[PDB]
Amino acid sequence: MYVFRLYVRGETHAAEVALKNLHDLLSSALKVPYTLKVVDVTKQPDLAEKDQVQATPTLVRVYPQPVRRLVGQLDHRYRLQHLLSP
Secondary structure, three states: OOEEEEEEEOOHHHHHHHHHHHHHHHHHHEEEEEEEEEEEEOOOHHHHHOOOOOOOOEEEEEOOOOOOOEEOOOOOHHHHHHHHHH
């Protein structure tokens, strides 16, 4: 029972690959299934502005807990690896 949110900018091949890679890593990382939705940072100011995104993609863990916000050039597993840590 977890809600997942991933942020991307417009239409980028790297962003989609990163999204799939992050989705892929999360699935393998977590035994239990989860729901992930795609949010357009440029299209929706409310989420983009509120989320304070600088470098894409931005990984936000939606409730139930744990709730997290991770923002940066997310093209490698190192950032994701510390993200999974308690």
